Design a protein around this ligand. Structure first.
Ligand code: CA
Ligand code: CA
Lengths: 483, 483
DNA sequence: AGAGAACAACAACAAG
DNA sequence: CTTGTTGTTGTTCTCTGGGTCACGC
DNA sequence: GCGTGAC
DNA sequence: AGAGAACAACAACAAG
DNA sequence: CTTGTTGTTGTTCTCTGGGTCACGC
DNA sequence: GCGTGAC
């Protein structure tokens, strides 16, 4: 139990032996502090104890190919071992999935990611079910539903009606899921509402474009040597990338005009109203918190959809002191939130909010719709538990919860609040954590591609297909079910 | 001495423990087979032996920062320890250096690389003296000679006349070295002669451009799914990048037209004469061997400058069977070899060839020029060995070597041939291996930037300056003076 | 939000 | 009391948010 | 038809 | 040329 | 004799070859 | 002056 310390003359060796590793193999410095690498060293001292200072390591150390082959063959067995743990939650209705399409930056292989989100008891699990290549196929909705089954066919799940899928509105994906539950991702919807509004307020394009022209100059001039904060670039594909660009200009406003002077290029700046640029980033900083708020797969998110919309409507509350071209922005913002974000929201968005204890907000026409909804799914989850064989009512429980009142402390979290409740409400609280497990964003599936991007690199480009599917799933598995 | 083998049940653990490393820390498969990583494991079994299966590793394992700091502080002491070994060869005239300018793909820091090439006895050493940032400075010749001294000031060498510098003809570099020995890099000169000639034979631009337009299509169409050989792209900055592009088109000629058919885009191909495309890659394949021939820092190169020029003149020997527009190419090739490559060659290029035993080739007007040259540098190296205190003649030796005749076997290498000679010619053979140590290319300095590119990456971009200077030098040092 | 990766400016300590 | 070798915070750079389908008129 | 709307 | 990194198609072997 | 777990060759993808100075007229 | 020639 009591773990030994090594002499200060012993660690002085490790510190200069590890340094030999980094430089010769060109590895990062943070390799040593990586959790996987830490456990691997514990095993090599373990072999040195039983065997001793003289061992043949080249024969002991596997070649990378046998490592490529084990990662392949150890990934198959893991997908089987979890075959039961996955199939349990999916049939209990508590399964949430996130799918999107990607293509890698080198081989340009068309890819389909799928992540799964379910609740065990006290926590949530976000894991990579797979990343499969479509191998230069049409990428039609038909082929995606095809590959989506092939992923589920590895864990033996075949149904088409249990799972709840969240995805953006892309035509391929949206039709491929036409046969079952589909939730439009609130991150894409927000980026739609935002981006659509600036397009509809071109009066502000002159301040934005000049900024973009300022950013372009510092990059072309080999400038940005200083300011100790860089100027970010537009790149409209990135979410809320216009706020990151403006705040970078703004914080460095003092130094940028100084550099713009000596160049004689101060034409590029003087035409920008700073009063407006400020007012934009203040109004757009609230969105940035919402953008992060709705990317959370480590905690309930879908319940926060309807709350944030209100927060968007209030940050745009018209002020008489708002310079014109800003009020037009405030207008177009709230206008699109209705016809875009609100128009695409389903019953699962309000029912996730109904299960947040300070739910007194909408007691209007949304209450009866939740009633007809959560009444049917409570018996539908009761249909499952009766099949598991091997007086307080459903509707009495609907009004029962309606009277509960919880003042919101910073300690209050709806996550564990039902863990400390469910004993009283066995037949409802199960439906709640089923709803609170839905991410309401594609962010989970998005980060999968980021990880995918890390593994297939300029040097590692030769990696095909399943090797990536394996390496992603296992790194996910080892974060999920291992402490 | 006799090194132990571990039970097959023990290696089955290592093979599945190493796999845990790769997936969790996202490391490459070839990390295990890296030489630096192999030695680091030998030390951890060594600690496990003396201490045992229970040790506190987190406390034993350094944090990356202390690794960043040791790599910095271990690099300073190494440059001192080699301070004597470097200063010895430079003053004996046997030092060759290679310098070039680079800028990194992320921070856009202006950089100056320097590599050093010298002969000890039986071998040659190519190492990284340093890569130093000019920190957004004019990059004038004055600042480069400035930084070049600061590198030498770390090994204590300050002279300006011993070293022999090889570099391209860039105006910054060429003037910065105006005060001492300078050798125009034969790789840039060749790429000049080549690239200049196609510019001067536009009659061939229509076949080349259509190929480039074919390559552009497969990349834009998400094609190149097959052929099992990719089509390469022009990118004229890359050396002999036009031959790589054409051979890729040619080997896949059968499949590319098939794909060009179904698209209905077969317009892009049919106008290409395959007879010509073939004749180009055959004539340009000889250059590719010369291009690799002159990039060698692991063996004498500079001696091969004058040989290859002849080989270029013979591959262009006019054939009556050569279709026109090819003969114009052959013409412009040999025309530029004179006014470009031959015009920029100095006495060090012929004197390196004079020391190749089958030197009977030019016994014409070049013989007397070598005489006046190597006679003065032999006493100049004798000026040094007399300062080291702490009958066969120079000119008699010039004619002595002139009568030697060596038939060239595949075993024959001028490298060791003087190692088996020098006893007879002590005062000459030292001058030879001084000449044969000169790379006659900037390739050594070029690969330094490639390595530099590997260490500063998207994730590692935060690395400043000296951390790269250290990490490059040490990885070079550990290949050079460690077996 | 998650995840990788390096460092400036520190804060505990230590040998001097 | 100065120095000098360690481990702490935090901050700063980076990646996913597609280069092509489905539907209506 | 071929544009618009996601992406 | 140097250096990183993965794999197809194999060739020794092994357990069956 | 079949299978199935290992280690061999080789082949294929990748990077440096600058996005800005010096000289002459 | 500002073009050309390396890069
Ligand atoms: Ca998508
Ligand atoms: Ca250069």
């Amino acid at each position: 139990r009591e773990l030994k310390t090594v002499s200060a003359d012993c660690k002085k060796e490790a510190i200069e032996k590890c340094a030999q590793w980094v430089v010769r193999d060109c590895r990062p410095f943070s390799a040593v502090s990586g959790s996987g690498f830490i456990d691997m060293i514990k095993f090599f001292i373990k072999v040195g104890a039983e065997y001793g200072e003289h061992v043949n390591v080249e024969e002991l150390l596997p070649s990378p190919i046998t490592l490529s082959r084990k990662v392949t063959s150890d990934a198959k067995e893991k997908k089987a071992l979890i075959s039961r743990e996955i199939k349990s939650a999916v049939e209990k209705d508590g399964a949430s999935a996130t799918i999107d399409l990607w293509t890698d930056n080198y081989i340009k292989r068309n890819f389909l990611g799928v992540t799964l989100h379910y609740h065990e008891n006290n926590e949530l699990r976000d894991l990579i079910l797979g990343l499969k290549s479509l191998d230069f196929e049409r990428s039609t909705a038909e082929n995606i539903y095809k590959k989506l089954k092939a992923i589920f066919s590895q864990f033996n799940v075949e149904d088409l009606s249990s799972i709840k899928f969240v995805t953006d509105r892309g035509a391929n994906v949206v039709k491929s899921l036409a046969n079952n539950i589909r939730i439009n991702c609130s991150s894409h919807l927000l980026s739609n509402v935002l981006e659509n509004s600036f397009e509809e307020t071109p009066e502000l394009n002159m301040p934005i474009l000049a900024c973009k022209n300022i950013v372009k100059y510092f990059k072309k001039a080999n400038l940005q040597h200083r300011l100790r904060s860089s100027l970010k670039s537009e790149c409209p594909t990135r979410w809320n990338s216009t706020y990151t660009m403006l705040r970078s200009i703004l914080d460095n406003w003092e130094s940028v005009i100084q550099i713009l002077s000596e160049a004689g290029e101060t034409q590029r700046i003087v035409h920008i109203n700073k009063s407006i640029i400020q007012t934009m980033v203040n109004i757009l900083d609230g969105f940035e918190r919402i953008f992060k708020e709705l990317q959370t797969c480590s905690s309930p998110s879908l319940c926060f959809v309807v709350p944030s919309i209100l927060k968007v409507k209030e940050i745009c509350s018209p002020d008489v002191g708002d310079v014109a071209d800003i009020a037009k922005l405030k207008v177009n913002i709230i206008k699109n939130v209705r016809i875009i974000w609100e128009e695409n929201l389903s019953i699962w968005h309000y029912t996730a909010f109904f299960f947040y204890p300070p739910a007194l907000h909408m007691q209007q026409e949304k209450v009866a719709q939740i009633k007809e909804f959560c009444l049917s799914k409570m018996e539908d989850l009761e249909l499952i538990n009766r099949m598991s064989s091997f007086p307080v009512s459903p509707s009495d429980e609907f009004e029962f919860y309606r009277k509960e009142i919880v003042i919101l402390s910073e300690d209050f979290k709806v996550m564990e609040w039902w863990n400390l409740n469910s004993k009283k409400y066995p037949k409802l609280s199960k439906l709640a954590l089923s709803l609170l497990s839905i991410p309401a964003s594609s962010a989970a599936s998005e980060r999968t591609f980021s990880l995918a991007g890390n593994i297939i690199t300029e040097k590692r480009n030769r990696i095909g297909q399943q090797t990536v599917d394996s390496l992603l799933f296992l790194n996910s598995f080892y974060k999920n079910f291992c402490k």
